[PDB]
Structures are given as structure tokens and as C-alpha cells.
RNA sequence: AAAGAGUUUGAUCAUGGCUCAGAUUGAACGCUGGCGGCAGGCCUAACAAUGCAAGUCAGCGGAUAAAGGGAGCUUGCUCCUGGAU
């Protein structure tokens, strides 16, 4: 995936006898604009050594998203933890009218007509799982109900 | 014919409040002074100086007593055929 994109970077800490030892955590999304997306988390003592690990772990664990072509397939809802994410299609002139951590995942999947909205928790590491489960769980023609519709 | 940020922790996730960016207004107020068009203008409390509703002459009575036509004096003058308007 080649349109990588960082979302959030957080300075987290740990106490020992001496005091707070620090480490930076970066959450980063990796896509190709065609329906392939992973997300990755990594930690290091320095910022770019953790972004790299977030790039690394997001190039594995990537997923084929069964889109319709530049939009979502149907209006969908998903949730991981207290984070809850509603996503739908838009028509043709709309862009990414979602926002934040959902704006990155629904940019590097190559969708550009979203109209997504998140409720509950806005913590981006769970909003990213909650967008990731909405996208992993669609199907346009792979209904096993043996019909044409 | 539909976007979120900031802030409780040594760090975390959650619950939850606050704060913010936004659009509006019969606006006030702080800073200046170019214009035009179209609008809008006591949201508050009442007491009021001084200047806007009246037309129809088809109803009498007043006024004019036409200029005119005279008359008397003679163009000063009053009554008149009529007496207007």
C-alpha cells in the first residue's frame, strides 16, 4: 500500500524507580486507493522510529474492501468498544464528509463519497477498528442467496 | 420545476461535564470617515408642548344688490328690466 497516512501520535509514559520513562505511540493507516487498507500501531522512544513501526504493521494485516466504485456499498453501522460508527453512500459530488480518524481510513480505501459519522467514543484507535469492521463486512454480489437480486 | 478539537491521569481506556471553531440578529458598544442601490429602524415605560377625516348648493337664510340694460344727479352717486356670479 502506497498512500500511507498518519492519524495520531501520542506521548505515553511509564513509571520506574527513577521516574517517567517515555515512549511514543503512532496510529497510522495504509492504503492503495482501490479497496485495500490496513491500519497499524507501533511504539518507540522517538517519534519517527514509531511511525515506521506503524507503517510496518499496517502493510501487513490489510483487507480487501468490497466497494461499489468510489462509494460505499450500503449504509452501514459498526462498533468496537464504546466507539460507534455509521457510514453510508453519497451520490457523486460529495467528498469525505466524515472526519478525523474515519477520514483517513475512508480515504486510503479509495472511497470518496462517504458521509460517515461517529458516536460514542471519539478515541481514534477504536474509531479506526470501528471503521475497519464496517469495511471488512460488506458484499455487493457475494450474497449466497442464490438469486440475481 | 450530517466532519470535530481542548481539558480529570505518571500513562490508559471508559463514563461524564465544561470550553471552542460554526451559522444567525430590529442588535449594542469599541475603534474611520468613499459611494450607490434596495431595505430596515423605541425590543425598554410610561406623561405629553405644538402642527392630520369632510365632503355634497341637489334645503333655507344670508352676501352680491353683476360688468350688462337703464333712470336720477352726470360718470362721484343710490334704486333698478333684472339682480348675476
End-to-end CA distance of chain A, in Å? Answer: 33
In chain A, the number of structural domains is: 2
Burial of A134 (0-12, 13-18, 19+ CB in 10 A): buried
Nearest nt (C1') to A125 (CA)?
A: B13
Rounded Cα distance, A147 and A61, in Å: 32
Q: How many CA atoms lie within 13 A of A136 on its CB side?
A: 14
Rounded Cα distance, A138 and A149, in Å: 16
A94/A130 same-domain check: yes
Q: In what order do the strands lie in the sheet with A117-120?
A: A76-80, A83-87, A117-120
Give the method of determination.
Answer: cryo-EM
Nearest nt (C1') to A96 (CA)?
A: B3
Q: Where are the alpha helices (DSSP H) in A60-138?
A: 101-108, 124-136
Rounded Cα distance, A137 and A33, in Å: 18
Q: What is the resolution of this structure in A?
A: 3.0
Rounded Cα distance, A112 and A89, in Å: 9
Nearest alpha-carbon partner for A12 in A42, A56, A53, A57: A42
Query: Cell numbers of A95, please?
Result: 467528498
Show the domain range for A13. 5-63
State whether the beta carbon of A21 lies below 7 angstroms from any atom of strand B.
no
In a domain, A141, yes or no: no
Task: Round to a whole number and report the distance in Å from the CA of A34 to the C1' of B73.
Answer: 132
Residues 81-110 of A with CB under 7 A from strand B: 81-83, 86, 88, 94, 97-103
CATH number assigned to the domain comprising residue A37: 3.30.160.20
Residues in chain A: 149
Rounded Cα distance, A1 and A34, in Å: 10
Rounded Cα distance, A139 and A21, in Å: 46
Amino acid at each position: 500500500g502506497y498512500i500511507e497516512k498518519l492519524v495520531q501520535v501520542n506521548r505515553v509514559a511509564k513509571t520506574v524507580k527513577g521516574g517517567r520513562i517515555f515512549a511514543f505511540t503512532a496510529l497510522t493507516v495504509v492504503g492503495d486507493g482501490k479497496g485495500r487498507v490496513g491500519f497499524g500501531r507501533g511504539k518507540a522512544r522517538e517519534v519517527p522510529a514509531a511511525i515506521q513501526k506503524a507503517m510496518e504493521a499496517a502493510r501487513r494485516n490489510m483487507i480487501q474492501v468490497d466497494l461499489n466504485g468510489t462509494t460505499l456499498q450500503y449504509p452501514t453501522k459498526s462498533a468496537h468498544g464504546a466507539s460507534k460508527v455509521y457510514m453510508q453512500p453519497a451520490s457523486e459530488g460529495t467528498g469525505i464528509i466524515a472526519g478525523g480518524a474515519m477520514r483517513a481510513v475512508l480515504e486510503v480505501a479509495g472511497v470518496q463519497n462517504v458521509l460517515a459519522k461517529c458516536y460514542g467514543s471519539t478515541n481514534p484507535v477504536n474509531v479506526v477498528y470501528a471503521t475497519f469492521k464496517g469495511l471488512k463486512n460488506m458484499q455487493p454480489e457475494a450474497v449466497a442467496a442464490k438469486r440475481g437480486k
